[PDB]
Every structure is written in C-alpha cells, then in structure tokens.
C-alpha cells in the first residue's frame, strides 16, 4: 500500500464520482492523490487482500460486513474526538461499534423503498396481495407490475421478514448465533408468496439488478424496489416516479434491513492519519456529503447538519419510514455466512431447485458449514502457496485438526498425483482472473456422475492448493482466496446433505485418521 496516497473502495452503485471530487479537493489542499475504485464483489475482495496487508486505505460498505473485518484484525480502530462524535447521530455510531470499539465512520442510513411510475400507476398498491391482479391488468397493456433484483437476498428480505423472518435473535444485549430466523412460518410465508409470483409469471427468477433497473427506467414496469442510490438514474430517464412505503404482506409492514454506509480504515494502511483527515474534515461535511449525494443519493446522512437540510425531501421521508418499519442489520462476523446461505435459499426456491420449506430449512447449517469450510480451505490454500502458516486464531479444535489432516493428506495427493495435476494445470492454461473463476465448472464436473466421497472432496481441495501454488508463481496471488471460496461454495451448495450425514469436518478428520 503506497504511503502518501489514499486508495478508496466504494461499491459501483454509489456516488464514486462525487466522492472522487471530494478527493480532488483533498489533493488540492494537501498534495495527496485520492484514487477511488469500485471493484466487483468488493465486500468479499476487501477481506481477501487486506488479510495479506494489501488493498485500499479506506473501504466503504454497509455496516453489516465490518464486524467480520474487525474480528479478523483488518480494521483500524478509528479515533474521533468527542466533538466530532457529537456531529453525527448516536444510533449511527452504534452501528459501527464492535466489541466496544468504533471500527468505521458512519456515512448514511439506507433502506429500500417502493419506487413507482406515476404515469402508469398513480395510486400504487398498498399490499403485496394486490400485485398479481395488477400485473395481469398491466400485461393486457404491454407492461408489468413489478421488477426488482431477485439475485441478492437484500431485496427480498423485506417480504421474508414481514410476517416473522429474522436473521439472528437479539436478547439480553447479544445476538444469539444459534437462533437463526428464516426457518419459521412467517419467513416461509413471505418467500412462498415471492415464489408464487414467479410461478404464475408475474416475476422472472432470473431478474437481476441491471435488468430491473433498465425495465423501470425505460417505463416497462410500473414498480421496482430499490434504495436512494438508484434515484439519480431515474431522474435522467424522465420516468415520473414516486418513492413510497413498501407494500404490506398479511397486513404487516414489509421490514427492510437498514444499512449504515460506513467507511473503515485498513489496519495495514500507513496512511491512517491522512484517512482520518479525509473522512473527518473533507467527506463528513455539508459540502463533502453534497458532492457525493449529487452523484448518487446517499439516503439519510449521519451528519446532523446536512441531514436537516435534506430531510424535507419526500423521498428521504419515505426511506426513513421504511427504515423505521425495518431493523438495523447485525454486524456480527456470522453475517457474511448468513447472507451466503440466505442467497442460496432464495435463489433455490425461486428457481424450483428446492421447495420453499427445504430451502429455508437448509439455510442455518449451510451458513455454519460455509463459514467453517471457508476458513479451513482458505487457510490450507494460502499456507500451501506461501510456505508459511497463518498464526491468527481460529469450532476451532476441529478446524485445527482438519488443517493438520490436509497437510498430510492433501500434501500426499499432490505428491502421488503430481504428474496428473501438472498435466491438468497445463491443459487448463490459467492466466488471469477469468480463468480462475471458470474453474468452478471443473469442480462441478468432479461430482457429475452423482458420486460423493471424502476422497473426491480432499482431492479437489488438494488440486486447489496445487493451483494456488501456481497462482503465486504467476503474480496472481490475490486469486487464491476466490478459488478457495468457489471450492467451498460447490461443496456447501451441492453437498450440504452429504456433509451433514458424514458429520462434517469431524467426519473428515476421522475418515483420514492414520
């Protein structure tokens, strides 16, 4: 990471150009160049590169991912003095607090709202239950009632949560990670309603962010569900739109997750003090937040002074009304694995790969297996590639034994089958990031004859280590943990049942015992 320079990562749907403009005012005053980037999958990439001491100086994401970052040592504790802390709303500081420390600067409060085309639908529905009849009416006219992103569970969560879904139970000052709330009647009722819309052809299971945004901004669909960042492209489209409270389901408010967009500082940055100066004295000011907001609306900002100025905006009022119906996201380190598991459940139910009930029943153990598997497999592939064991801490006994097993068994596979593994690598001709992403097709082919056993599982992880050694060799070391993640995904997404029956990683250690 370059000293005397700031590199900032923010998601590509946010106002990164406005933020880069704030960066230019910083550079003007200081000589420090500010580079703003919007990598894909940055919320997964950031912990990967930061773990090796690289990556951006500053990372922007909703607050739900930062607990996991902090737990892994990847974030600097920030040090705002009392006067600065008083300039932002107290509940936004609460969102960026982890094990008693501030780990990020709060920027803005986000919640999803219903966005509707006033020319197609001046009186939008108050209930989800009305949408099928409305869609059938709009189809006779060449239109559709509603399109929104079905590939990210963030967007279906308001409906799942409406009748009782929840992520983790909060009781006695603590989230209880053993009490996950998607395998209950209300969550199932909400997701069933969503899958019925798809089954009856009011919705298409393949709809993603880009498709829904294009349809609404082209006036092809009467409604969408999206956050404040989306308002600016609608302005450009000259669709005449309103932003309103989400529909009710079984008479209950939709309950969107509330995110606080937050800016954390890399623990590996040599520019911590410059980062603090940029965030406190340039970004978190009326003029700094205005430049970002004019690019893509931020929502209800954390800075009291500027939020008072925008609060008259009726679109912000609707955001805050949906937010009050919803719930602030937990920030515990299990949130990443939760989202992995709920994303699979929603996509599986929507597509018919599983029933609604089976899909949500799997989610909890899927999240626990994912988290444990990802750590084991990622640690093995990294130590194989670098020659050095990771000293950071760890379900920890089992994960320690599993990794000891891999050093013996996985190393053994790579010894005995080196000639095969070398020809496989030559044949695949891995050069770049797309090459590595495409290996998920290899992994599925390992299991396509329908057989699963521990030997195939360990061989796939062993080949993953073999490929990872090669990736460091060609200066693509950052691709190692995406590889580990795709191996982990194939195993948990398609072999969850088998892993559970075989006692997971305890069974793995047992099977390969000397």
């Amino acid at each position: 990471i370059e000293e005397g320079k700031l590199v900032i990562w923010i998601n590509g749907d946010k106002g990164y150009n406005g933020l880069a403009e704030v960066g230019k005012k910083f550079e003007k005053d200081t000589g420090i160049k500010v580079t703003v980037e919007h990598p894909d999958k940055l919320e997964e990439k950031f912990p990967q590169v930061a773990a090796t001491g690289d990556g951006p100086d500053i990372i922007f994401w909703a607050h739900d991912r930062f607990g996991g970052y902090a737990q892994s040592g990847l974030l600097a504790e920030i040090t705002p003095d009392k006067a600065f802390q008083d300039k932002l709303y107290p509940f936004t500081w609460d969102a960026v607090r982890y094990n008693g420390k501030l780990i990020a600067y709060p920027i803005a409060v986000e919640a999803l709202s219903l966005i509707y085309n006033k020319d197609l639908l001046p009186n939008p529905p108050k209930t989800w239950e009305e949408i099928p009849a409305l869609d059938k009416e709009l189809k006779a006219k060449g239109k559709s009632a509603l399109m929104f992103n079905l590939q990210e569970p963030y967007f279906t969560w308001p409906l799942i949560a409406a009748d009782g879904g929840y992520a983790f139970k909060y009781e006695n000052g603590k989230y209880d990670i053993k009490d996950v709330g998607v395998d209950n009647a209300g969550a199932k009722a909400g997701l069933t309603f969503l899958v019925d819309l798809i089954k009856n052809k009011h919705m298409n299971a393949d709809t993603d962010y880009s498709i829904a945004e294009a349809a609404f901004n082209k006036g092809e669909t009467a409604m969408t569900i999206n956050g404040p960042w989306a308002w600016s492209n609608i302005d450009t489209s000259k669709v005449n739109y309103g932003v309103t409270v989400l529909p009710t389901f079984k008479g209950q408010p939709s309950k969107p997750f509330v995110g606080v967009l937050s800016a954390g500082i890399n623990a590996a940055s040599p520019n911590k003090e410059l980062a603090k100066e940029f965030l406190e004295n340039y970004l978190l000011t009326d003029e700094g937040l205005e430049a970002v907001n004019k690019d893509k609306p931020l929502g209800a900002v954390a800075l009291k002074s500027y939020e008072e100025e925008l609060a008259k905006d009726p679109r912000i009022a609707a955001t805050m009304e949906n937010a009050q119906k919803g719930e602030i996201m937990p920030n515990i380190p299990q949130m990443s694995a939760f989202w992995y598991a709920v994303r699979t459940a929603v996509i599986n139910a929507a597509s018919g790969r599983q029933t609604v009930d089976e899909a949500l029943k799997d989610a909890q153990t899927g999240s626990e297996l994912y988290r444990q598997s990802l750590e084991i497999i990622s640690r093995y592939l990294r130590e194989q590639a670098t020659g050095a064991a990771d000293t950071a801490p760890m379900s920890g006994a089992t994960s320690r034994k599993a990794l000891e097993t891999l050093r013996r068994v996985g190393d053994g596979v790579q010894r005995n089958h080196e000639t095969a593994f070398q020809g496989m690598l030559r044949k695949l001709d891995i050069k770049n990031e797309d090459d590595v992403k495409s290996l998920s097709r290899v992994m599925i082919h390992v299991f396509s004859d329908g057989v699963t056993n521990w030997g195939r599982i360990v061989t796939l992880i062993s080949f993953g280590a073999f490929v990872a050694k090669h990736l460091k060799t060609i200066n693509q070391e950052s691709c190692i943990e995406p590889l580990a993640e795709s191996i982990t995904d194939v195993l948990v997404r398609t072999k969850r049942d088998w892993l559970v029956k075989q006692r997971g990683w305890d069974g793995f250690v047992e099977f390969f015992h000397v």
Partner: peptide, 22 residues
C-alpha cells in the same frame, strides 16, 4: 466431454483412488 470435463473426471478418478486407500 470437453477440456474442463476431462479434468473434472480425472479429479474424480483420483478421488476414488484416495477414497479406496483411506
């Protein structure tokens, strides 16, 4: 079966050898 299919199938054969061994 194609190139990625061939690799994947050889990984399965190797895995079955390992499975039998252990």
């Amino acid at each position: 079966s194609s190139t990625m299919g061939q690799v994947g199938r050889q990984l399965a054969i190797i895995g079955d050898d390992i499975n039998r061994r252990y």
